[PDB]
Amino acid sequence: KAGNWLPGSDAPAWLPDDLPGNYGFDPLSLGKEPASLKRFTESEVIHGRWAMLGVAGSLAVELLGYGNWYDAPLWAVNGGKATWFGIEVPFDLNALLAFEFVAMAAAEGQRGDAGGVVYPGGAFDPLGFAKDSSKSGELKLKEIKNGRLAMVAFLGFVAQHAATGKGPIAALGEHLANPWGANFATNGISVPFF
């Protein structure tokens, strides 16, 4: 067991001890049925991995000064040419959707027929970090915790943007400038009154 989400509380019985990232957090008992838990265990990792790439991509765009994650796809609706690191890309919206759909369908289709493999290894582990059984146990915990943090972080980007209408890095600088003047309470939406 990784830890305890609510100190002084009991751990659910249906959650195995050796399941990575197990803090005994299941207030709604959504994973009580073994069949449901198996699907959700895979989905959490898949969501985490996508979020980690998503958060990194969102921060990289703004740190390098090419815009923010929100307004990257505006050129399609506004009318313009795509860019990546500042170099023009010839494709257009129709071309991107077709290629993305085909590529994702083929790659995701292969995973779908696997049956729920979360840690394939081999071709996906060229450096063989998780080859050793003992070492893999702790790496899986590290992966999910960073993944869970990334999932929350991305939710922060979307929620914060809706309230403040600014990118993540822009908001962070604003908070540092005036910590007591710029925050969720002072954006005029998060707290109904004041």
Partner: protein, 212 residues
């Protein structure tokens, strides 16, 4: 069924059995039988402490600041009515302070609730595991670091009775501030001065009849 040896709010009156003197300040006062159900009375016992303890702080925080101002002690917040402190301008906006307030209170209150749900389960420091509260503490009375001076090691029963008596009086006082402030329109200590100036002609009967 309540024994006649215990203090009674109304001497010579029959009183509920479930008020058997276990709780502090148990004078058998429950004309509406609110606390009849033991489960509910278990909750009401903690609610009285929480409402009482905040009331004692609130009343102290409404009289002392005004008392100092009259004595002449000067500080930037001097001369501000207890119901005008919200409008006063501080280093940070009221909204930002409110947001911090709830985040801080959310941690401590849930910590307090966890003990109430399962006593003794929230007596350990999450970070520095060496720290810990005494294992004998009961809900509503943490002790340990919350009792640095060890007063709880003396006549605890008397101290509990003294706390609830001062607390109950404090709760009534705060209701007086709202009623008096809403009616008189002035600060509490101003009302006391008016009453002392002419106690006989300054009763609430005099004051309210004049208004209507």
């Amino acid at each position: 069924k309540r024994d006649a040896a215990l203090p009674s709010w109304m001497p010579g009156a029959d009183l509920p059995g479930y008020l058997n003197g276990t709780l502090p300040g148990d004078f058998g006062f429950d004309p509406l039988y609110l606390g009849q159900d033991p489960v509910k009375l278990k909750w009401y016992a903690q609610a009285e402490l929480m409402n009482a303890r905040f009331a004692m702080l609130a009343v102290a925080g409404i009289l002392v600041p005004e008392l100092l101002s009259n004595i002449g002690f000067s500080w930037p917040g001097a001369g501000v009515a207890w119901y005008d402190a919200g409008k006063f301008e501080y280093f940070a906006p009221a909204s930002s302070l409110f947001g911090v307030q709830m985040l801080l209170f959310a941690w401590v209150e849930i910590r307090r609730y966890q003990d109430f749900v399962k006593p003794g389960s929230a007596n350990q420091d999450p970070i520095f595991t060496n720290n810990k509260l005494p294992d004998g503490n009961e809900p509503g009375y943490p002790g340990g670091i919350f009792d640095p001076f060890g007063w709880s090691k003396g006549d605890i029963k008397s101290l509990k009775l003294k706390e609830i008596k001062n607390g109950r009086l404090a709760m009534l006082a705060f209701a007086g501030f709202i009623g008096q402030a809403y009616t008189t329109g002035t600060t509490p200590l101003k009302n006391l001065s008016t009453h002392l100036a002419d106690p006989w002609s300054t009763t609430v009967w005099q004051n309210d009849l004049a208004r209507l």
